[PDB]
Enzyme design. Structure first.
Site, PDB file in Angstrom:
ATOM      1  N   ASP A 112      -4.193 -13.809  -2.333  1.00  0.00           N
ATOM      2  CA  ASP A 112      -3.726 -12.162  -1.485  1.00  0.00           C
ATOM      3  C   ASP A 112      -3.955 -11.967  -3.030  1.00  0.00           C
ATOM      4  O   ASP A 112      -3.692 -10.468  -2.910  1.00  0.00           O
ATOM      5  CB  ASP A 112      -2.308 -12.459  -0.594  1.00  0.00           C
ATOM      6  N   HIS A 119       6.309  -5.820  -1.069  1.00  0.00           N
ATOM      7  CA  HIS A 119       6.074  -7.353  -0.003  1.00  0.00           C
ATOM      8  C   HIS A 119       6.903  -8.335  -0.958  1.00  0.00           C
ATOM      9  O   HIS A 119       7.349  -9.873  -1.242  1.00  0.00           O
ATOM     10  CB  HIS A 119       5.167  -8.031  -0.332  1.00  0.00           C
ATOM     11  N   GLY A 177       1.258  -9.784  -0.218  1.00  0.00           N
ATOM     12  CA  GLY A 177       0.958  -9.270  -0.212  1.00  0.00           C
ATOM     13  C   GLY A 177       0.433  -8.134  -1.334  1.00  0.00           C
ATOM     14  O   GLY A 177       0.208  -6.676  -0.513  1.00  0.00           O
ATOM     15  N   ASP A 201       4.869   1.196   6.631  1.00  0.00           N
ATOM     16  CA  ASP A 201       3.168  -0.135   6.669  1.00  0.00           C
ATOM     17  C   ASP A 201       3.431   0.070   8.474  1.00  0.00           C
ATOM     18  O   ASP A 201       3.978  -0.762   8.552  1.00  0.00           O
ATOM     19  CB  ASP A 201       3.869  -0.457   5.455  1.00  0.00           C
ATOM     20  N   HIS A 230       2.451  -3.688   7.560  1.00  0.00           N
ATOM     21  CA  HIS A 230       2.611  -4.897   7.951  1.00  0.00           C
ATOM     22  C   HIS A 230       5.297  -5.038   6.574  1.00  0.00           C
ATOM     23  O   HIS A 230       4.689  -3.810   6.639  1.00  0.00           O
ATOM     24  CB  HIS A 230       2.278  -4.999   6.202  1.00  0.00           C
ATOM     25  N   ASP A 244      -1.860   1.461   6.235  1.00  0.00           N
ATOM     26  CA  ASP A 244      -3.079   0.894   6.676  1.00  0.00           C
ATOM     27  C   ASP A 244      -2.972   0.956   8.946  1.00  0.00           C
ATOM     28  O   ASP A 244      -2.704  -0.524   9.233  1.00  0.00           O
ATOM     29  CB  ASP A 244      -3.309  -0.664   6.858  1.00  0.00           C
TER      30      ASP A 244
END
Ligand SMILES: [K+]
Ligand SMILES: [Zn+2]
Lengths: 5, 364
Positions: free
Chosen positions: B89, B131, B139, B166, B168, B255
């Protein structure tokens, strides 16, 4: 712990 | 003073273009904004680079020194990297420490602009990497620019609201301020076992003195504009009434937009725009951040549209000629059309999450 990706 | 600050320099955008998971995205984003001439209606401010001291206000020295070490040559095979969350990642692409420091410094610069009263809105579309932890990358995030921006805002503002839209969970920002009530974090995100980062259930409300000052809205696949705004507005309404924020940091990862390869949410920039509008209505110092977004053209379409929303401008539907014009074919329009897949969000589950959040905020 995770993977994003 | 009423004109939004736009954090930009050609050299900054070039550095942001080098991020492994989003190559050329920063250029495409700025290029489209420029093609709509929106930059001419904003105050362009060149970002300062974050000092080691500024970075160490949240990140540990061991992690900073490691990041700096592997970033020098590009050692993405350094054995100690896995401890600090570097790997798949977050690869150790050369210069990543300096790239991350530029973004960190960019968000800090935006925050400083807000402190000084230069603007009510400051924008860093290349920030929002929420993150990263104090001692590990995560992330696609190496430095948590959002936390750095929040720590900067804490110089003037005693109650800061972080809102992450987001896909996430903004786990890094929530972690950083889990124990404090000075900062309230609000994250709308996909929450499903095995989906990154795996945290942020509605039951996660922070710890110690910071209990109930963390807010999470777990959402399932396929949500669209209408339902998303209803959820967001009703949460932000309670949060505003209960927390009375003095400043807002808004993370707008793209996203969630239909056409993203992650293919989870089914949003359009118009839905996110209404959320942005509701926040802007508060007329508070607002730091605007990007984040995820892995359909690059769509991410540029989204943040360009949102910049228009910030400026209160209606944009032409046709994508104007510019450096990346061909990336928007064959229809060449700004609008995004949602996919034809199901919404997995039952209204009763949504309502219960809502009421559960209502109950938590009572303690605030
Ligand atoms: K908190
Ligand atoms: Zn994301």
């Amino acid at each position: 712990r995770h993977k994003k990706x | 003073s009423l004109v939004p600050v736009y954090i930009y320099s050609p050299e900054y955008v070039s550095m942001c273009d080098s991020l492994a998971k989003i190559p050329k995205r920063a250029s495409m984003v700025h290029s489209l904004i420029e093609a709509y001439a929106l930059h001419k209606q904003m105050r362009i401010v060149k970002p300062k680079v974050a000092s080691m001291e500024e970075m160490a206000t949240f990140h540990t020295d061991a992690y900073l020194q490691h990041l700096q070490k592997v970033s020098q040559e590009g050692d993405d095979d350094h054995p100690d990297s896995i401890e600090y969350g570097l790997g798949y990642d977050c690869p150790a692409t050369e210069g990543i420490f300096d790239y991350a420091a530029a973004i960190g410094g960019a968000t800090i610069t935006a925050a400083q602009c807000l402190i000084d009263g230069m603007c009510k809105v400051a924008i860093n579309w290349s920030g929002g990497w929420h993150h990263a932890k104090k001692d590990e990358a995560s992330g696609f995030c190496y430095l948590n620019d959002a936390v750095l921006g929040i720590l900067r805002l804490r110089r003037k503002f005693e109650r800061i609201l972080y809102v992450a839209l987001d896909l996430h969970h903004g786990d890094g920002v929530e972690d950083a301020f889990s124990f404090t009530s000075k900062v309230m974090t609000v994250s709308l995100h996909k929450f499903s076992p095995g989906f990154f980062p795996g945290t942020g259930d509605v039951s996660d409300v922070g710890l110690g003195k910071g209990r109930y000052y963390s807010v999470n809205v777990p959402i399932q696949d396929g949500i669209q504009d209408e339902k998303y705004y209803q959820i967001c507005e009703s949460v932000l309404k309670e949060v505003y009434q209960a927390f009375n924020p003095k400043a807002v940091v808004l993370q707008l990862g793209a996203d969630t937009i239909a056409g993203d390869p992650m293919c989870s949410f089914n949003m359009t920039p118009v839905g996110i725009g209404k959320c942005l509008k509701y926040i802007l209505q508060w007329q508070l110092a607002t730091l605007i951040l990007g984040g995820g977004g892995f359909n690059l053209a769509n991410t540029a379409r989204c943040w360009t549209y949102l910049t228009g929303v910030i400026l209160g401008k209606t944009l032409s539907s046709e994508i104007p000629d510019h450096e990346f014009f061909t990336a928007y074919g064959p229809d060449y329009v700004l609008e995004i059309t949602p996919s034809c897949r199901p919404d997995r969000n039952e209204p009763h589950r949504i309502q219960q999450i809502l009421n559960y959040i209502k109950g938590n905020l009572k303690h605030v």
